[PDB]
Amino acid sequence: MRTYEVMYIVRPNIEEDAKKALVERFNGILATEGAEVLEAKDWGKRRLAYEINDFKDGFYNIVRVKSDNNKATDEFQRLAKISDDIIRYMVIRED
Amino acid sequence: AISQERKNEIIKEYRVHETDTGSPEVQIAVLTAEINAVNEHLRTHKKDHHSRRGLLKMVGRRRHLLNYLRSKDIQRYRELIKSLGIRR
Amino acid sequence: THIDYKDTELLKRFISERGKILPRRVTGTSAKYQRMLTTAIKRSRHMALLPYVK
Amino acid sequence: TVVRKNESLEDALRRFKRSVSKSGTIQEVRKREFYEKPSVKRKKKSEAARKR
Amino acid sequence: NIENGVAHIRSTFNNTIVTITDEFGNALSWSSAGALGFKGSKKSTPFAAQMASETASKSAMEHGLKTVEVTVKGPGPGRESAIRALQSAGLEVTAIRDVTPVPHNGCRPPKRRR
RNA sequence: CGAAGGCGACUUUCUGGUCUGUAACUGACGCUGAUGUGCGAAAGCGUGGGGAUCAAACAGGAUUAGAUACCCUGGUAGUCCACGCCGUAAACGAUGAGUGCUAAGUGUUAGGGGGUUUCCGCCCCUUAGUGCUGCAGCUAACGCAUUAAGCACUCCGCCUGG
């Protein structure tokens, strides 16, 4: 029912597919489980404004979820600091 | 706190006439389930004290409809006391 | 319409150039116009698109 | 954060003192010297601003 | 070693110390700002940051660095008479930076002085 | 915004509640509000993160004619927060709460109303308010005057020398 649109970043020293295969684990979170995902805004070369992971680039990743349960974002919220590839998220909702 | 389709759901099953919103019985499941909402919703937030009087001040707004159910027609009050579960 | 926090181009003329936010009085907008633009600023500022300070 | 070059140091001193002037940096560390109470911080937020 | 560095000062209200260093801080020499016999209400001078500025600047003698790009990180009486007056040595001051600590309401600050 | 104590980097969760507009409906379903129940600012009785900064108590240095006072720090609980409260403030808008009516101008917060249009801005109707000046009436005067202390009605509470 609610439309959650998380915004994580990945480590921007990557290729196109192994980035997408990394967020394929996120597509198993933020596109499966009855999500009916409209789009996947995973951006390329933005510049990271401050020195998180001391990086030269930044690959912004807005992925929508849409569920009446809110499992996906808070699942990957509980995943994020544990793993060592994901850095951000910013979910939003609108009605 | 209460969604539009759900009140418009209970006017199908519990109205006294057509366009009868504001009825005594049309704020009982609206009252007590939204209590039962906030009964569990302030079970989460133990300091939801302003939302606590939100349902208690409309206990009397339904009770005055139960109070109004006496003087005009008492058989509707025998009907509506025995319709659902409300004490006293 | 509502301004999203990715259309910086019609938003950055309201910001301060050295890291901060300019107010609503010198910018010439209304209160709801400022406040919904502030959400576009805040979700840009806090989420690294606009910075805090550098 | 402002580099002043292609000149002498006088307008560079008059840039540094101006970059200090157009900033909530020296005013902020002037603001953050001691504590004013929130019963009296609104006396500053009214006698300088509600009269403006 | 020469031609690059940072003249890293933090010009306080008393005793504006000057430490010349590289662009990656290694502090070739520093100067205590009371080195001109300034003890009480005396290191708050223009001249604590005029000659004791060059008691380590003219007496650098180690890198021979000439492009300095001095950085200030605090308020003081010898602040404008530091960036001018580190160039009392005449050391081609180029890039002054007002990178001072501005906490977004950092802690609980102290009490008013009665 | 919140009844009030109050509420401040934010992103999200659960919500409260405010308000406008259309006003659909029930046919006054209201107000005071003794009892009762809550909140209840700060400090104090105590716990665990607290002693980083601040800081009672204590300390040091001198000034000063006088000290350790006005100057200064170090620093103890107390601090910060969570975990129990106590039931107190100039908790004052020094105005209890609900309803009718009598000069204005002036900004401003939200919704509805538009005329030109504007390249999103000018002018103006209205609602609810937030404010600032200001009749008649008022008081002892201050001052109030649509966010009445004016002109009327209902209820509670309180007062009558120090």
UniProtKB/TrEMBL annotation, chain A:
Keywords: Ribonucleoprotein, Ribosomal protein, RNA-binding, rRNA-binding
Superkingdom to which the source organism belongs: Bacteria
GO cellular component, one term: ribonucleoprotein complex
Transmembrane segments: none
InterPro entries: Ribosomal_bS6, Ribosomal_bS6_CS, Ribosomal_bS6_sf, Ribosomal_S6_plastid/chlpt, Transl_elong_EF1B/ribsomal_bS6
One Gene Ontology term of the molecular function aspect: structural constituent of ribosome
A single GO BP: translation
Pfam families: Ribosomal_S6 (PF01250)
CDD domains per UniProt: bS6
SUPFAM superfamilies per record: Ribosomal protein S6 (SSF54995)
NCBIfam families reported in the protein's UniProt record: S6 (TIGR00166)
Function per UniProt: Binds together with bS18 to 16S ribosomal RNA.
Family that this chain belongs to: Belongs to the bacterial ribosomal protein bS6 family.
Designated name of the protein: Small ribosomal subunit protein bS6
Organism of origin: Staphylococcus schweitzeri
Organism phylogeny: Bacteria, Bacillati, Bacillota, Bacilli, Bacillales
TrEMBL record, chain B:
Key word RNA-binding present: yes
GO terms classed as biological process: translation
One GO cellular component term noted in the UniProt record for this chain: cytosolic small ribosomal subunit
Keyword Transferase assigned: no
A GO MF label: structural constituent of ribosome
Superkingdom per UniProt: Bacteria
Keyword field: Ribonucleoprotein, Ribosomal protein, RNA-binding, rRNA-binding
Function according to Swiss-Prot or TrEMBL: Forms an intersubunit bridge (bridge B4) with the 23S rRNA of the 50S subunit in the ribosome. One of the primary rRNA binding proteins, it binds directly to 16S rRNA where it helps nucleate assembly of the platform of the 30S subunit by binding and bridging several RNA helices of the 16S rRNA.
Record-linked NCBIfam families: S15_bact (TIGR00952)
Quaternary structure and partners: Part of the 30S ribosomal subunit. Forms a bridge to the 50S subunit in the 70S ribosome, contacting the 23S rRNA.
Similarity-based family: Belongs to the universal ribosomal protein uS15 family.
Protein's name according to its UniProt entry: Small ribosomal subunit protein uS15
Native species: Staphylococcus aureus
UniProtKB/TrEMBL annotation, chain C:
Classification of source organism: Bacteria, Bacillati, Bacillota, Bacilli, Bacillales
Biological role stated in the UniProt entry: Binds as a heterodimer with protein bS6 to the central domain of the 16S rRNA, where it helps stabilize the platform of the 30S subunit.
Family (UniProt): Belongs to the bacterial ribosomal protein bS18 family.
Keyword field: Ribonucleoprotein, Ribosomal protein, RNA-binding, rRNA-binding
Subunit-structure text: Part of the 30S ribosomal subunit. Forms a tight heterodimer with protein bS6.
Cytoplasm listed as a keyword: no
GO cellular component: cytosolic small ribosomal subunit
Gene name, Swiss-Prot/TrEMBL: rpsR
Any one GO molecular function term: small ribosomal subunit rRNA binding
Ribosomal protein is among the record's keywords: yes
Name by which UniProt lists this protein: Small ribosomal subunit protein bS18
Annotated GO biological process: translation
TrEMBL record, chain E:
Keyword flag RNA-binding: yes
Keyword Lyase: no
Matching InterPro entries: Ribosomal_uS11, Ribosomal_uS11_bac-type, Ribosomal_uS11_CS, Ribosomal_uS11_sf
Single biological process term from Gene Ontology: translation
Alphabetized GO MF terms: rRNA binding; structural constituent of ribosome
Short name of any one Pfam family annotated for the protein: Ribosomal_S11
Entry keyword set: Ribonucleoprotein, Ribosomal protein, RNA-binding, rRNA-binding
GO cellular component terms, semicolon-separated: ribonucleoprotein complex; ribosome
Family annotation (PANTHER family): 40S RIBOSOMAL PROTEIN S14/30S RIBOSOMAL PROTEIN S11
Subunit architecture: Part of the 30S ribosomal subunit. Interacts with proteins S7 and S18. Binds to IF-3.
Function field: Located on the platform of the 30S subunit, it bridges several disparate RNA helices of the 16S rRNA. Forms part of the Shine-Dalgarno cleft in the 70S ribosome.
Similarity annotation: Belongs to the universal ribosomal protein uS11 family.
Protein name: Small ribosomal subunit protein uS11
